[PDB]
Design a protein around this ligand. Structure first.
Ligand code: NAP
Ligand code: EPR
Length: 318
């Protein structure tokens, strides 16, 4: 039986430092994966409207509660608002659909998924006549305002952001009449993209960081063979064997020792268990410095090249 360390948020709520990622987890597999994760000791699940698997995640959560395998109060469920729903009435609708699918009465954290607003309508990925993303009417500051109302009504415990640069976080914090501060910024992070400056900034403002794609998202559709590959990095593997651990476990531990929340995804039962077995070893200061030195400023997940729209996050240095 396993328990992930708590990272305290600015609201005093406790966020498990390891959670389960659910992106690309297919229907027919994610239910069992969540069941396995909960049995193994995971209490933090990372979800999203756009992953379109939340109802299956909801079933597994409900069945485990009925089973008395776990209590709601000890689960930590995160989902995300997709940018085609930034317009106020759509925030509540998308949120409601997420909450129904998940079979919950509240979410622990609700994130802005991506800072650029997209055209509303039936398409989740609106493009023009070329494959160019079409922007929306509402900005992420508009969406936030509607999201704050969710917190006022007890439906969500805390808010956060995903894929924000420090400029965009600045914009959020400086917003007039801000009711709630983000408790986390969820961003890609791993040894090829160390986010030293972004992490430094977020921490200085009492904002935690959640590391996504910590294994380098090998199952991402657009992966190319020549693309750098963290799980096969001989230097990572060599630090692993010294601790009698797998590479995946080092990659996960790396975030833990920087106090960064981390959410590796798997639908494979043995890997789900292996991924939370990371509290029984410690990387030395030297080993941490070596891994930090692998930074390549490489983004595994950067399929959105919508730099024509305002608030493209990745043009900024951090
Ligand atoms: N914009 C955003 O906010 C955003 C973007 C991307 C991801 N995320 C979140 O972060 C989560 C994690 O990122 P990600 O899904 O991109 O990828 P990732 O967790 O870095 O890697 C997932 C891949 O690694 C494999 N894997 C898992 N554990 C392994 C192990 N112990 N040994 C070997 N292979 C292993 C998985 O295989 P199997 O599943 O087949 O075992 C899957 O192919 C996502 O699921 C999502 O919740 C958020
Ligand atoms: C191309 C579509 C996108 S935009 C985006 S962020 N992601 C990752 C995620 O949703 O977590 C995508 O796969």
């Amino acid at each position: 039986s396993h328990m992930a360390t708590f990272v305290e948020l600015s609201t005093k709520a406790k966020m498990p430092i390891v959670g389960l990622g659910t992106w690309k987890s297919p229907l027919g597999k994610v239910k069992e994966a969540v069941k396995v994760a909960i049995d193994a000791g995971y209490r933090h699940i990372d979800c999203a409207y756009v992953y379109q698997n939340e109802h299956e995640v909801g079933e597994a959560i409900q069945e485990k509660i009925q089973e008395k395998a776990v209590k709601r109060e000890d689960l930590f469920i995160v989902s995300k608002l997709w940018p085609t729903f930034f317009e106020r009435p759509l925030v509540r609708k998308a949120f409601e659909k997420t909450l129904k699918d998940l079979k919950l009465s509240y979410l622990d954290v609700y994130l802005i998924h991506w800072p650029q607003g997209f055209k509303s309508g039936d398409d989740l990925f609106p493009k023009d006549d070329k494959g160019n993303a079409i922007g929306g009417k509402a900005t992420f500051l508009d969406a936030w305002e509607a999201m704050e109302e969710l917190v006022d009504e007890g439906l969500v415990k805390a808010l956060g952001v995903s894929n924000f640069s420090h400029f965009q976080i600045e914009k959020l914090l400086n917003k007039p009449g801000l009711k709630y501060k983000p408790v986390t910024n969820q961003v890609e992070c791993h040894p090829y993209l160390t986010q030293e400056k972004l992490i430094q900034y977020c921490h200085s403002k009492g904002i935690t960081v959640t590391a996504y794609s910590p294994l380098g998202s090998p199952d991402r559709p657009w992966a190319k063979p020549e693309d750098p590959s963290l799980l096969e990095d001989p230097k990572i593997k060599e630090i692993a064997a010294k601790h009698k651990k797998t590479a995946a476990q080092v990659l996960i531990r790396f975030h833990i020792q920087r106090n960064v929340i981390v959410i590796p995804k798997s639908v494979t039962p043995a890997r789900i268990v292996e991924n939370i077995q990371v509290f029984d070893f410690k990387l030395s200061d030297e080993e941490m410095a070596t891994i930090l030195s692998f930074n390549r400023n490489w983004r595994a997940c950067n399929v959105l090249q919508s730099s024509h729209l305002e608030d493209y996050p990745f043009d900024a240095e951090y």
